[PDB]
Amino acid sequence: TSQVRQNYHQDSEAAINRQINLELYASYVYLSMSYYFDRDDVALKNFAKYFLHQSHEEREHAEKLMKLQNQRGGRIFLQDIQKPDCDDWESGLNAMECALHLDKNVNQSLLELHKLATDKNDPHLCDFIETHYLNEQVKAIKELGDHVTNLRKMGAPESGLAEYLFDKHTLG
Amino acid sequence: TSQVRQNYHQDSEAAINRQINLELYASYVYLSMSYYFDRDDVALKNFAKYFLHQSHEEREHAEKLMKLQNQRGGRIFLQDIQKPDCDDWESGLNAMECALHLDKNVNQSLLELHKLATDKNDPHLCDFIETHYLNEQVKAIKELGDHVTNLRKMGAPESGLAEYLFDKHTLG
Amino acid sequence: TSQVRQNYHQDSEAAINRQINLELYASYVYLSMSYYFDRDDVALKNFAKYFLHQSHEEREHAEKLMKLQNQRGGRIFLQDIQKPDCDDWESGLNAMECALHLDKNVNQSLLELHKLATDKNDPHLCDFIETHYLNEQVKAIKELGDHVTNLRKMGAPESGLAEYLFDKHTLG
Amino acid sequence: TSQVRQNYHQDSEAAINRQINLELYASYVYLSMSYYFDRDDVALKNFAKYFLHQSHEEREHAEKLMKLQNQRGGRIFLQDIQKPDCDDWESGLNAMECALHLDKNVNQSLLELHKLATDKNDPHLCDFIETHYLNEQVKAIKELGDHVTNLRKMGAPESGLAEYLFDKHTLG
Amino acid sequence: TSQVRQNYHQDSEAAINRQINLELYASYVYLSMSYYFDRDDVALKNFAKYFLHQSHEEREHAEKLMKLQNQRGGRIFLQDIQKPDCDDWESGLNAMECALHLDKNVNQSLLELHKLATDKNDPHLCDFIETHYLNEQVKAIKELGDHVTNLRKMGAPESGLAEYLFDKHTLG
Amino acid sequence: TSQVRQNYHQDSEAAINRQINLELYASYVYLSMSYYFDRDDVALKNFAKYFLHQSHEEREHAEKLMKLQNQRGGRIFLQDIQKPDCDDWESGLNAMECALHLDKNVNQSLLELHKLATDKNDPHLCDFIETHYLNEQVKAIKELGDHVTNLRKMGAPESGLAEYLFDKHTLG
């Protein structure tokens, strides 16, 4: 038991360690999506940049949870980072749809972490999650939804014109 | 035999002289492609600029090989620069496809030059080719492939809209 | 088969994909080592910074190989990133010893990749590896060896004084 | 027939296409002369620079004629660029004598082009040639004559002292 | 056996130690040549400066090889630096001829070192030699050849006028 | 006999030539000591810098004596530079002790040179030696003595802590 540990439940500790793995996984999915758009037969450079940015943010989120763990006197236990579900992400629209899905899954896990912190009366953990994670996640999900909507309305994925112009005018 | 000549095989000398002619030819093809896009009935000003830039780079590559020849104590022997295969390059997509083809043919010749330098144990020539030519060539080929992919996906050559917007948003 | 692919052997492609996984793994090991030094019962802030820097460099190395793959017309296939061997890295000296070991293992893999590229007469891949990877790896290994030597001479891991002063005067 | 074509005779069009080839050839001769002076057994660096500058100007002149062709609604037809008459240009004086000769031959062709434009009552072509080509050509020829005179008076080609000092004091 | 040593053959180690001695010797020859030109009965101040610069570069090359040795885990073994063959270097032309000769001898040794590194499959050593040594050596040899050519053409060593003007206009 | 020679005894000339060799040797010893501290199993970077600085100063001292020789109308005769007595300098303290010893040996030779110049009534040589050499040598010896004292008092060579902290706080 850490000399700093206070009001920090075993279950919260375990849940943070799960959250660290999930942020790392999300980072990995976005890394895979970015370089898919860097292929010579896909060639949408701003989709690639957009997803590489999201990838580095997810890693940064992981790092902040790892800092949180040590702050509270918890002990970090890392797990394998699972390769993503796809190697080939099909189109800019499909990738955005999969990103939206992934962000909601990460959000659900954040919400469950907050429920747990509430159940354990850990107001420091509750506020940490609300301050750094919940509103950022909500903004991301709204942005990914906006992107999906625009791509669909432009006639993606069928219109390669649509994905080309979106890359230029929205992601550029 | 030059007072500077050292470890420089007759065959390498001949092969450099062939490479100088090929870079000059590539310069010429790109020159022809540029001014095709400057015609009043083609009128894609950024395709024209793009290909004029590639043309001057090829000439610069020729000049660097000519410098290399003299550096090593070889003797430059120039040959006719052959007019390109086409006068009319048809479309922005077709021109990019022909540029891709040409760059791979030049790359193949660079690779054969490197094999020869290796077979003759000429590490200075090997590194010259790797330093100035191989990665530049690989980048060019990846870029031309990206361009071809985007044009095709936008609906070129049939969509004159596609070639117009590509000229603006990618080459502009 | 990619429109850009040229002189790029199936085996090189596979070997790059293995190298991408290994750089990612090394990134992960360093991430784990960094936050070990951020524990309240370890508390060596510059060891933590040092290893976090190495972690981000490894990720950057992975990203550059992923770019290389697409450049050459290869296809990126990602694998799980394995959790590191330890959760608790014991001391600054032990962590540096494990870092040295890891960097030599990564170097060995780089060397095998270069042998393969040589055997396949792929001078572009040979030079890529020499330019970005081999000398950087040699510098890292020399630096980690210097660090290990100094820690040992100061009386680490037994002297907590030694690890404290090294963190201040060398890593600070 | 181009939508822009006006008062532009078939013969003028053909003559411009001949002029483009000749400027390109002159560029090539000067390129060859430059790198002759870059040989380790010739080694007059400012003769080399001087002739490389003239080479790039000739190419630029070719490009301006190609622009002219398209401006008027003509169609560019490129021909082989013939290798120059010599590989070895003998001395700085001899090269200047050959440059003088070449510039007068190019001038003669410019004058014949102007006669033709006059005979076809094409005042736009007449003025184009007078504005960009005739006075520039006359200056070049006067300069090359000045250079030849000075080299001869200094005792070139026999005095290697003379060619060395001219390179320093006039071309440097 | 060094904790950093990897893929570094005993023969490479020995060959680096030989190369360090040769760069040091070349430094010494150039030092001797410089101060010959500083004699009151020779008095060519820019020949003296030129050769002193080359001398310090050679020492710097030695130092970089010594760094390389330690980088790879090799052990530096220094040998006597032999006094140069001459005390009196006769003329600016003769000194340049001897410098050319010396640089080719050093180049030959560099090439043999590269053959050895290749035979031992040491791509790090191969690239080190190509990156820092081979092109620098080729440039030096081309420059020394240019200098020899110009001196000879001006009428050195017989013309003391020629050596005086070369010192001013080329080395100044 | 040089047109500039005046009041410059054959013995002084010979003694200067001996002094040039000794400064060069001292330069070499310091060069060897520097790179000993650059080994991965020694790793004291500021000891390495300190001794490399001393090395370049000794070379500069040699060069100034060579200038002196020519100034006075003497003739420089160079001898082999002998490899130093050790390859492995053992510790920072031992290296400083050997440096102190070497500097006193060089000082003794300077003093004998001054006695000779005095005996030959060569006030220009006497003052040259006093101005550039004697006080610089005395400062060096006092500094090396200070360093030795501090290392000994800190518990070097046995305390690797002592050598590490001295490198940081005194040589850094």
Ligand SMILES: [Ca+2]
């Ligand atoms: Ca798995």
Ligand SMILES: [Ca+2]
């Ligand atoms: Ca709150």
Ligand SMILES: [Ca+2]
């Ligand atoms: Ca033909």
Ligand SMILES: [Ca+2]
């Ligand atoms: Ca596992």
Ligand SMILES: [Ca+2]
């Ligand atoms: Ca290389």
Ligand SMILES: [Ca+2]
């Ligand atoms: Ca012909």
Ligand SMILES: [Ca+2]
């Ligand atoms: Ca000897």
Ligand SMILES: [Ca+2]
């Ligand atoms: Ca000896």
Ligand SMILES: [Zn+2]
């Ligand atoms: Zn996140």
Ligand SMILES: [Zn+2]
């Ligand atoms: Zn090229």
Ligand SMILES: [Zn+2]
């Ligand atoms: Zn790496």
Ligand SMILES: [Zn+2]
């Ligand atoms: Zn012209």
Ligand SMILES: [Zn+2]
């Ligand atoms: Zn050298």
Ligand SMILES: [Zn+2]
């Ligand atoms: Zn001294």
